[model samples]
Target: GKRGLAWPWYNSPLDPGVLNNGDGEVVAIYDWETYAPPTSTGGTGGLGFIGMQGTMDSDSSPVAQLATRQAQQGWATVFSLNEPDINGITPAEAASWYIEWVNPLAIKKALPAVTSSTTSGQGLSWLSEMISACAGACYFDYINLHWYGTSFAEFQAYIEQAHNQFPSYTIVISEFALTNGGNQVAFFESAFPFLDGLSYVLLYFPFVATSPALLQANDPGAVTTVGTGSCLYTNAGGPSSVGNLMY
Candidate 1:
């Protein structure tokens, strides 16, 4: 694979510092909390910490301190709602909540992320409903997306479908990975280049940023569903085969 310049924007809970050997591959790190990262992780580039208020309400990132955190951290973007489309937050409710809280931030923003679920009142359908509920008043720069499925073809088509549906907004692939038994390394081998080629992709964060040992122990649910082949780190704390392609 091409081991050239890479933009490995991370979605890891395994501490962004572990990936410093990736050179400047990891430009930014996403931690659900609003605090600044440990201050030295991205090598010379120094990882930019992206604040994510993973829910409509969070104690780690209190809604009352949303603006306070933004200014304190000087982050350029904010990712909202991890998967509210399946989390029982109705589209109208999220729309109102987003308008009240998410809209006020004086920085780039993404709408509450939805799943790739093709269910009624979910996925893009849910986002459309929320946008409709917003009635053209929700200020956002990107339409957030999270997908976990089989096949690069399916992934490509799904991203295109989202783009065609909302051509006006930039695309942010907040999470993605192959399910159990698929070629996770190959999936990213194809994905990294593919996502980089897309001008509309504001940012892309592959799911879970830990070693297999940590992944299996912490998120057993993902271990069974998506397997550990997608993990970016090895047990020895170096890049795994998947993250090797990243460097």
Candidate 2:
């Protein structure tokens, strides 16, 4: 159905079960971490988990943790590099880094998530350089993208352009949202079906799964930029207005 959760490493513990029930649109989930989502602590059971190596190397995403975490929970897919294009990791460097760490995953692997920016070395340009540097050796199956835009039409255009740019690989919108203040419900209402209809769009995730209170306290920066409209839960934990469109 092309529905997934762009989950965060947080305390509230939103359950994927609710979104994975019969007639549900959610089929996959990821939290940008090496550890699997534990049901006992947070109740994120039901959806297939996809592990992520969010960075080249860090305390959380250690170089060895990718395979070790894969062995622990057993993931069939792994998302690599959160946003190296925007984070100052050069394309050539990321190309080699991905080859070293992500190529060995032996699963459905995705390239680093790129932003929607059209900057000279930021969005598709950044991705193109990495692919070119790979010299046909970087093994990956999907091109991951993240978007936050003014409207659904603009969002559609960016995704469509990305499709044209990389027609060979499957497209995974790992994170997306209409920029703060837009009608999120309206945007997603059109977005869900639009994404489901696309044959090459393997998966798509909304910005977040937590509520306003948690988001306000934990990720106030997100609130400042994308606003709380993208949140799928209410402050106390319930399906939000836009969340009703899920599952």
Candidate 3:
């Protein structure tokens, strides 16, 4: 899961035999679900799936594609809502969209999970309400929150807010990192305490300066302590490592 460039499962969707050949156990994460052939391609939902951009055309949105295909196949689908372009859309509007457009689809289909990277952008204050809107609208099998800050306290606050709202929602930190300008060692240390399974992020720890030792020092419990946190360490390696480590 390093560099956010890989999935642990079978790579190269070239084998038609294995493509869409699972026991209906596939997990779908599409920025927009569409009718494109489920080819081993270059996106998540299609190859690399994330969430809906604000510009998603309702008529042509991938959501429509997946919806149509599932209907024809008579196979249930699992839908996970990621940042639903809730930026410009008011909370009320966001809630309405979820209840109407998002929730019903989830009910008819299955919901694998719902997550957002928006909290990192909007800060923890908005996460409770935002996730609450998502959970209330649909049956979220898991609730996810992403936090990238310069301090351990900051990340914990984000996690706490998510738990307070959806007590039962399985939490995950989708993406996390410090500002490019921040101190690397300090940043990693700050993030250690918040290493609960519910937290998932693209971690970069290959460098000597930001070794696993630093991670253990801040949140030794992260590696040894395990309970309600989730994370996928990534190698922000090669060129990216130079800038942080060179100086």
Candidate 4:
């Protein structure tokens, strides 16, 4: 049913076994970088790689250049900006930039990923404005989404609402989890099957693919917001309590 991973750039060199084991459920993995290499030889067998720009502007190189690199890498799918609605980018700005930098690539593309926030000028509202601004010019295959909440019902509602808004395009839940201190395993037990059942939902990646220990060490800021309970792996280079669900 299209299980995948939103592999973080910080979690370099994920254990080969994580990708190789577990009945071969992993179908894709992405690190939000324009060019992400395979994690291991034959370990990522048949696992697709989804590339991303992740930023409106990267200090290291031009966005267009990076896009070209991804295209040259022969990735079939590319993800545009990450959380542009909350990242100081206006809808109009993102619309123009996406068209210029991301639209030309002859591959499946996703719109700028948005959060679950219902605040004005944020979340789905922002995406709607951007599509309106594009006037049907932005060529994208999926509408990307990220959700963090305390309940499965809320997550389901947000996803259904997204489908209601853009029924024509498929949806990719690139990131999702219960908020800090919420029941992680319970959330996935409910979410995985629900997502798998939706034909319109193309792929779903849990919020992360790292161990609780790695998350706390590499992302202190994220640790405060998301906590470590949702991590899919344990520090001993094995699946955590939650990672076992992906299989």
Candidate 5:
């Protein structure tokens, strides 16, 4: 096996600016190459990508710089405040942060990254506030989510409510795959349908769902959740997850 993984620039030959398409929204890739800390870069070059460390509460200069760039570039569609946890802030505080602190001046719509996980520094509570704040502030174009959760129905329900309250805005499954460390089969089944709208996500490994062959038959740009195996075909629910998520 390769000692390390390859980090390639996200290329959409069909659409170079996949994120900017009027109909097709943006999907910010949270790769080290795409979005690394300012320290990783020298004084010579400007910040290349808008990125966040795996911590939402971090007030790192690099993260702030990325947010400012998003506003200036007219690429206000999406942004990620990585590693979001409750951070002991009350929901009111979290919402306030999203409005005043998180919203970049040039941003038309930003998507702060959030997820469910045990508190070890990175938690989901901050993310919940981030989303709730985004919806409240209505500064963001869409509410973004990452789904490596244990229960699809539960998470789906969560997103459903978000969608309802923010009916004018869209929701994205920013980063997700079948299983982080659970039963890969059930994990895959739960997440496949959630990948609609070219959901922003990270592919840890390869899966049959995203294979060239499968994509050609189904959605052209659709990606399969790697390491999760082939589509169940019969029982495998289609991308109907979006309907539930949106409606």
Candidate 6:
């Protein structure tokens, strides 16, 4: 498993403190797009940047162009769609699309990130359907997940469920946080160790990588939805108390 940041494009000029601070164990940063070439800060601190074909807009990047870009840029893994189940794309459609565009990439790959929904046609069920649709033709390396839960217990259950359902595949929890700002310090205190101890969990990123101010300014809806307590940045543009634990 790896440790990293799920960066947002709007948060460019990332908080350098996150990378330079002694607490730095971040080995990767992913922006959910094919843009943004990688850059090294120096030495062992150099971070690998992952590309994602996550939205309809990114999908518009010609498949050939996307493949060539990753080859030239040396990306080691590529995340698939953002959340196709909730976004109205069926499993069958996603399978066909994934085979056409994402399957060709030589690097590691992940299935479309799914939500925590337990509904009939979303979440893990959606991923299962997509796998069936592929019928061994589609190639992917991991199962990506996003979660927003009220408790650490619930978060653990969801993660365990994902692993149970896809036992052979490693899991990457790309996005997760308490839906409210309640006791976030405690949330990560438990979460970090639990996830770090799991053999099936490959990587996990807190919901975002931006200062509270930047998050509110760039995506107020998200701030409204997830609360500011879990934000990894302080008002001063350094790691917040929650972010410090990542060190």
Please give the CA lDDT of all the candidate structures.
0.76, 0.84, 0.37, 0.82, 0.39, 0.80
What's the TM for model 1?
A: 0.89
Each candidate structure's count of clashing pairs: 0, 0, 25, 0, 12, 1
Give the poorly placed runs of model 5, Cα more than 4 Å off: 1-28, 32-64, 71-76, 116-138, 150-166, 179-194, 197-247
* Residues forming the 10-long window of minimal summed lDDT in candidate 5: 1-10
**What tens digits encode model 3's per-residue C-alpha lDDT throughout 148-239?**
44555665676666567556555434334443344544554444433523333222221121223333444455335321122222122111
lDDT of 6 at 11: 67
What's the best-to-worst order under lDDT? 2, 4, 6, 1, 5, 3
lDDT of 6 at 139: 90
lDDT of 5 at 205: 17
Please, what are the lDDT tens digits per residue for candidate 6 over residues 117-203? 999889999999999999899998899999987999999998888888888989888888888657877888899999999988888
Cα lDDT of candidate 4 equals: 0.82
TM-score of each: 0.89, 0.96, 0.45, 0.93, 0.45, 0.91
Best candidate, TM-score-wise? 2
Q: Decide which is better by lDDT, 2 or 4.
A: 2
Better of 3 and 4 by TM-score: 4
lDDT of 1 by residue, 125-236 (tens): 9999999999999999999888999999999999999989988779877778888999988888898888888888867777756678877776788798888888777877
Clashing pairs in 2: none
lDDT of 2: 0.84
Candidate 6 versus the native: TM-score? 0.91
User: 220 in model 2: Cα distance from truth in Å?
Assistant: 1.1
